[PDB]
Every structure is written in structure tokens, then in C-alpha cells.
Amino acid sequence: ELAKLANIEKEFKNDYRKLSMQCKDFVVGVLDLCRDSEEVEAILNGDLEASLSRVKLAIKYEVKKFVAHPNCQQQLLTIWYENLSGLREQTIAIKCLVVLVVAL
Amino acid sequence: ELAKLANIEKEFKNDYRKLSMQCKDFVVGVLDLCRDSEEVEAILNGDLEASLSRVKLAIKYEVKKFVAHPNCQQQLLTIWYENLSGLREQTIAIKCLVVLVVALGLPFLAIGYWIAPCSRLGKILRSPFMKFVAHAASFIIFLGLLVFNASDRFEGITTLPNITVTDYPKQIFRVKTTQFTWTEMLIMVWVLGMMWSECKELWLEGPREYILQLWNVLDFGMLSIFIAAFTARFLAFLQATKAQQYVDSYVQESDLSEVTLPPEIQYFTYARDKWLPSDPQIISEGLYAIAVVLSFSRIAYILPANESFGPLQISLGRTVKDIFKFMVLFIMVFFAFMIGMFILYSYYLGAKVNAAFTTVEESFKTLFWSIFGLSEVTSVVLKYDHKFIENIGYVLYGIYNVTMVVVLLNMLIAMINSSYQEIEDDSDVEWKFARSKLWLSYFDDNQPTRYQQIMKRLIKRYVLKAQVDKENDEVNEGELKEIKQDISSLRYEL
Amino acid sequence: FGMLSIFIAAFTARFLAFLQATKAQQYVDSYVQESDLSEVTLPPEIQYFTYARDKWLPSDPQIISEGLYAIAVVLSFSRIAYILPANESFGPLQISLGRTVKDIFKFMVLFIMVF
Amino acid sequence: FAFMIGMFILYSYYLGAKVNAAFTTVEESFKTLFWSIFGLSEVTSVVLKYDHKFIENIGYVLYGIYNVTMVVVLLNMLIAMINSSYQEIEDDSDVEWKFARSKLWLSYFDDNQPTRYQQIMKRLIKRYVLKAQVDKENDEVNEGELKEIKQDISSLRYEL
Ligand SMILES: CCCCCC(=O)OC[C@@H](COP(=O)(O)OCCN)OC(=O)CCCCC
Ligand SMILES: CCCCCC(=O)OC[C@@H](COP(=O)(O)OCCN)OC(=O)CCCCC
Ligand SMILES: CCCCCC(=O)OC[C@@H](CO)OC(=O)CCCCC
Ligand SMILES: CCCCCC(=O)OC[C@@H](CO)OC(=O)CCCCC
Ligand SMILES: *[C@@H]1O[C@H](CO)[C@@H](O)[C@H](O)[C@H]1NC(C)=O
């Protein structure tokens, strides 16, 4: 809402953009404090009672530091390799062998 | 350990790199506090009960500020001039006189070196600085031999290429062009020696050490190109000797131009107009022309031992190491436009103004030379009407000339980010970590101990300095807590 | 979507070029009554499909096909931008390139006026 | 110098049969490699009249490596020049320029009981010492008051 009023006012341009930074830094400062994996998997998707709903909603609003934080990146990486799990730390030669085998 | 976990995690990348800075700054802060020379010579090499063990271990781990600190640099400088000791502060003219004298008297040095235990000049020649000057002088005499070999043609060749000329009619012509001269023998002796030294180093260092450094592979490739060129020259010499042994036996004439020869032996009478396009002579000239250009890249072994041209080289190495990421992206756009330009103009080989774009090699040639402003517009125009084809050609060639400039612009601006990142007090440090590495290439070839007492004194001084700085970091809070506790006693007494 | 449409337009032009040559072949194989097609001359509409590339009409479906097919192959190597962000070394390069290309156009509009 | 010696060693035997007269002597090879950095040179100095295509391709490759290397060196020069501007910072160009012009001006000017001078110098040094002590006292205000009230609390403990 603040980031859309910034494009409609254009004279109080810097003030709404100064308030949107507080609205983003609150979320990043909450994200920092989580310790167990249950707290991370309670923040990144909402109340259930995958499906990464808050992350897919933070793409639309472009909150870059909420997605570029390590506590979200490790949760995305454990989905990006969700059955391979030994290729997660290998050389680029082993990765090129994979794409050559699949392309063949 | 922290700097190796940083390359394996890659999500907690900044944290391990933040911890490695503390692990390095502890060592630098310990190094600061040493006062006598015994403490410096107790830190820089470990407990003995030269051999600079901690310095040689700080090269491997790349701790740049531990080697670029002055208390280590003075200890390395007192080894780098360990018998000269008056040359330590002299002008550059006196230093150039030294390298000129040693470059002149190079063949006297082995005669003076078998004497060396009986000579004070033998110990005065076995210092690291004299070894460095000797290797530099030998490599300069090598380039001098190449340029002098290239001599006698500096103002043109004297004849025409298709005309032959020999000492006598009997001599076959192909011998005189391929036989050896005295300077090429010295080149042959010199290349084998450098190949032998690199052969010894590869056997001891191992393949991983050779493969790890890009510079080692460049040197070894230059030596191999020299050897291949001389083998091609020798194969060219042998067949001419065989033809001369044929003619001098079975000639039975007055001149070799009088009676015609069998046609295999007839081929070795022709000038350069009629040689086969895969002649060993031609291959020899090509590879020998590549190797001479590659053999002036060896001055990078010399240049870091100088203050003025020192930090220049480091920035040049950084920019050359940072170009290749842009180069890989530029290859994709280049390949796209060359495949499109080849698919367009391939059917018009017979009817064009210029011979460009009609084959893949020529399209590669035109799109490569078009980025240096050395190309024509009139490669695009053709002879027939077909104006749709010609306008699509103009449009695609214009899009290419705009795209290369944009990519170039992006490269320059990204280069600026590195300078801002460099900030200050690092080029001086980085350059020092260059030259010391170069110096360490030549140095080679109950009741506690004294060492533990010295180390205990150093750690005690570090703890005391840290507590003094922590106490002076916050002065008011202790006094306020003390006067609050005093007000507690004043409330208890009143 | 534009790259895909340019491909489809080029192949439709090629097919329109193929149909008329099939019509001329079905004419000649029916009404030829000769030994070779070079022997007896033809009606002049069917005669046109014997010429080489020197005498084609400047709006031939073949020429349009070659031009659009030459544009589409150049446009079809811009799809590697879907691949490149999944890599650490060529990752932050692309982003700066996208930023500079997005920032050129404001200068380009001002350059068009002077030009 | 590296590229000119290589280009001279390559094309020296082909003086009679080339399109252009370039690279066939040291003076001419110097000329071509000097004017090639200002985009005032031809590709057709490399091509020759005979077949010998190995020689011609090595010529094209070395000339391309030269044209890339000069641009890289040039790029390095420009970026290193930027470091000096960042180092210059502010309040120095104005100062440096003044130290120019005054030098120019000084080229033309040419052709017991203490003295007055020592009284003036004594007054100046006294003012410098006083200003330094005032700035050092105002650099740390709270610590003297806390030490004074601690010493006053000592007397309050002695009296009570
Ligand atoms: C300009 C190219 C010269 C390359 C080497 C170089 O700069 O070093 C200059 C001195 C060696 O330096 P020092 O150890 O005396 O220290 C220089 C002090 N700034 O002497 C040499 O190392 C020069 C050896 C060359 C003689 C043939
Ligand atoms: C250099 C162009 C290659 C484009 C893709 C690319 O860089 O990605 C490299 C890997 C994928 O990366 P990962 O997810 O394994 O992570 C890389 C870790 N730095 O493998 C690929 O995605 C490559 C697929 C191409 C094979 C045909
Ligand atoms: C637009 C229609 C151009 C008509 C074709 C013609 O005859 O020449 C014009 C052509 C050749 O110079 O223009 C260009 O170079 C295109 C540059 C585009 C920049 C993104
Ligand atoms: C690689 C093989 C090239 C074949 C030789 C030929 O016929 O022309 C290609 C040659 C001349 O343009 O290419 C170059 O300019 C080389 C540039 C290299 C950049 C580091
Ligand atoms: C050699 O080439 C020159 C070129 O002008 C020509 O005049 C001459 O006749 C040629 N000589 C022979 C022997 O072919």
C-alpha cells in the first residue's frame, strides 16, 4: 500500500519510500530470530490447518532481503535437491557429466 | 579450516569469512607487540630445539598482512642482502652497473664458482640477490641471441623469392636454406636446459602443483613449441642431405643444372614459389614465429622485484583475471550473429561485391574484424536486386555493432566497482605479498625452554593491552556504578 | 512469442513456395509428351519455374522465407537468459547487463532527436 | 617490441610476393604496428600471394592477439587513473593550484631586554598552548566532574 501510494503522490515521494523500508525491515528482523526448523517452517508458509505461500507472496511485493536471507535459502535448497542429496556438494565436472548424460 | 568451509557451505558464506578475519587479526596483533630482535626471530620461525617456517606457512594460507608488516620485511631484507650490505641503500644507477657487469661476466662465473670455498667472492656470489641477477642476465642473453639470429635481414632480403642462388652448381639448393648456423646451436643448448629444469620441478612438485598454477603451464607450453619447431627443421635437413648424397654419387656431370634428375630429387631444386603447402620448413617457420612472441612473457618473473613497476603488474593481473567472465558472455552473441549472417548470404557466393559472409571462416573473420573498426559496409551489398535480403543484412549488422558497444560499456562499469571495493591500504599490501613470495624462491638452497618464556611474555602483553583498551572503551559506567555502590553505603550509614 | 511467430511465418511462406512448384510439375508430367523439359518450350507462366536465382521476382515466397528464417535464428539464441541465472559465476553479470540495457533507452530517445 | 620482432621474423622471406609492403623490414613493421593502434591500418597487409596458408593463418592470429592486448592494457591504464581521483578526495586541487601560482609570483618579486620579535612570538605561542588546552579539556567533559564528585564523596565518607 505504501509502495503504491508513492507512485500516486509524487510530491511526498521520499516519505512513503522511507516507511516501506520500515515495513520490510520488521519482517527481516523477525526472520533473524528463529532457531529451530519448526519456526522457519512456520514463518515461510502460514498456518496449514511445500506450499511456500509467504515466499510466493514476497516475490510479488519484491522484498529482496526476505528471500536473500540464508534461513530461507537453505529451506529452498533442501527442496531444489529433494531426492538427489549427494550432488548438493560436487564439482562442476560432475554436474557437466550429468547434463551430458541427460542430453544424450 | 574456516576458509575451506566457506567454499563448501556457500549459504553461510559471509559468516566463515567474518571469522577468518578474526583469526588473521589475532596473529597481526601479536606480531605488533614484539620489541627485541629475539622476539621477532622467535615468532617468524618456531622452536628450533633461516628456516623461516611460519613465514613459509603464511604464504600457503595467504595471510597478506602478516607478511606485509614491517617487522617481517626487515627480517627478510637482512637475508636478501646477507653479504653485500652496502648496496642496501644505493641509487638505481649503481644497481644497473651491477647487472651490466654480471651480464658481461656471465661465462667467468662458473670458473669463479668452482673456486668458491677458497674465495671470499665465492661466498659473495652465493647470496640471493646475486642468484636473481644471474638468472635475469642469462635470460637477457637468450633474447639477445634470438634477435641476433634474426639478423642480416634488418633492411630487406637481398634477392627475390623465386630466384635461386648457390655457391657451386653441384650443390643442391635446398641444403643451404635448411642447414644450421652457430647461433642456432646455442639456442638448442639453451632450450634443453630450461626443459631440463622444468622436468626436475614437475617430478618433485607433482601434476597437481603444475596444474594449479596457470603460469607454469604457459612456460612448459612455450618450451614444447620451441622443441617442435626444431624437430621440424631437422626433418627438413635430413631429406636434403639424402638428395645431396644421391647427386654427388650418381651425377657424372659438370653441373646440377645441366642434366635433369629423377623427379623426386628434382623437387629439391625449386625456390619458395613451388614448395608443397605442408613443407617441414614452413611448419618450422610458423612454430618458431609463435615461440619468439611467447618467449617475451617471461619478464613477469622479473618485474615484481621493483617498486615502480610493482603495483602496476598486480592490477594488470587482476583485470586480466576479471575479463574472462565477460568474454564467455561475448562469445554467445558473437556466435549468434555469425550463424545468422552465414545462413542469410550462403546462396550468393557467385554474385557479391565482396567475398564476405559466404563461408563460416570468412563470416568469423568479418565479424571479428568489425569490432576494431576495420571492416567495410560494402560486404553487405550484392549485385542482384533482391532488396529484402540486403535490407535484412544492413539491419542485422547494425544491431551487432550496437550490441558490442553495449557489452563493452557494461564491462568498463563493472571494472569500476572493483576499484571502489579495493578502497585503501591494500595495493601496498598486495604488492608486498607479491615480492616476498619471489624472495622466498631464492632463500632455499619442569624447566621450560627459552621459546616458551618468550611466547608467555608476548601473550601476557597482548592480554594486558586488550584489557586496557576495553577499560578505556567505556570510562563513565564504572565510575557511575562505583558511586552508586558508595551511595548505597551512604544510605546504610545515614 | 514474437520469435515463435516469426518462425511460423517463415515456414508458411516456404509452403506457399512449394505448392506452386507441385502444380507446375503436375502440369508438365501430364501435358509434356516429350523426352526432356528443355527440348520443347512451355507456356510462359510454367516457364518461370525453370529459372535460376538470377531471374526470380523481387517478391518471391522463397526470398521472404529466407529473410524471416534468417531473423528467427538470430532471435532464437536469446533464450539462454532462461538458463544463465542458475549459476554463481555468470549470475551477477546478467543483472548488471539488464540494468544497463534498461538504462540506455532514456538516452536513446534524446539521441534520436539530434540524429 | 615482442609483437614487432615476431611479425618481422615471420614475413621476412616474402618481400617479393605480398599485396602490401608491410612487415618485410623492421622499420616497416614498426610503422604498421604503431599505426594499428589508431585504427589506421589494413587487414590486407597480412595476406600474401602464394598458397602457404599456414603462414597466413599464423599472421592473422598474432595480429588479432596484438589488437586485443593493446585494448586490455589501455583499459588497465584508465582504471588505475580513477584510483588517483579517489585518492585526491577534496580540499586539495584548490590548495595545489594555489601552490602553483605563488611560486610563479615569487619569480618576479626578486630584483636582558628582548626584541619586539620575541615578544610577538611569545604571545603567539602562548595563545596556541591555551587553545590546545581548551580543546583538550572540552574533548572530555564528564570524566573530570566524575573524578571531582568521587573525591567529594571521599570527603563525605570521611565526615559522616
Ligand atoms: C626495469 C626492469 C628491471 C627488472 C628488475 C628490477 O626492476 O629490479 C631492480 C633491481 C632489483 O631491485 P632491488 O632489490 O635492488 O630493490 C629496488 C628498490 N626499490 O635490479 C634488478 O633486479 C634488475 C635486473 C636486470 C638487469 C639485467
Ligand atoms: C555455463 C552455462 C550453463 C547454464 C546453467 C548453469 O550455469 O548452471 C550450472 C549447473 C546448475 O547449477 P547448480 O544448481 O548445480 O548450482 C551451481 C553452484 N554454484 O548446471 C546447469 O544448470 C547447466 C545445464 C546445461 C547443460 C546442458
Ligand atoms: C529500420 C529500417 C532500416 C531500413 C534499412 C536500410 O536501408 O538501412 C537502414 C538500416 C541500415 O543502416 O538501419 C540500421 O542500421 C538499423 C539500426 C537499428 C538500431 C537498433
Ligand atoms: C582460432 C583459429 C582462427 C583461424 C584463422 C583464420 O582464418 O582467421 C581467424 C583469426 C583471424 O581473424 O581469428 C583471430 O583473429 C584470432 C583472435 C583470437 C582472440 C584471442
Ligand atoms: C620471378 O618473379 C618475378 C616477378 O616480377 C618475375 O619478373 C620473374 O620473371 C620470375 N622469375 C622466374 C625465374 O620465374
Residue numbers in the entry:
A (entry chain B): 232 to 280, 292 to 346
B (entry chain A): 232 to 280, 292 to 687, 758 to 806
C (entry chain B): 462 to 576
D (entry chain D): 577 to 687, 758 to 806
Copied sentences from the primary study:
A key component of SOCE has been identified as the TRPC channels, which are calcium-permeable, nonselective cation channels belonging to the TRP superfamily. Among the seven members in TRPC family, TRPC3, TRPC6, and TRPC7 are the closest homologues, and they are unique in being activated by the lipid secondary messenger diacylglycerol (DAG), a degradation product of the signaling lipid phosphatidylinositol 4,5-bisphosphate (PIP2). TPRC3, TRPC6, and TRPC7 share several functional domains, including N-terminal ankyrin repeats (AR), a transmembrane domain (TMD) with six transmembrane helixes (S1-S6), and a C-terminal coiled-coil domain (CTD). TRPC3 is abundantly expressed in the cerebellum, cerebrum, and smooth muscles, and it plays essential roles in the regulation of neurogenesis and extracellular/intracellular calcium signaling.
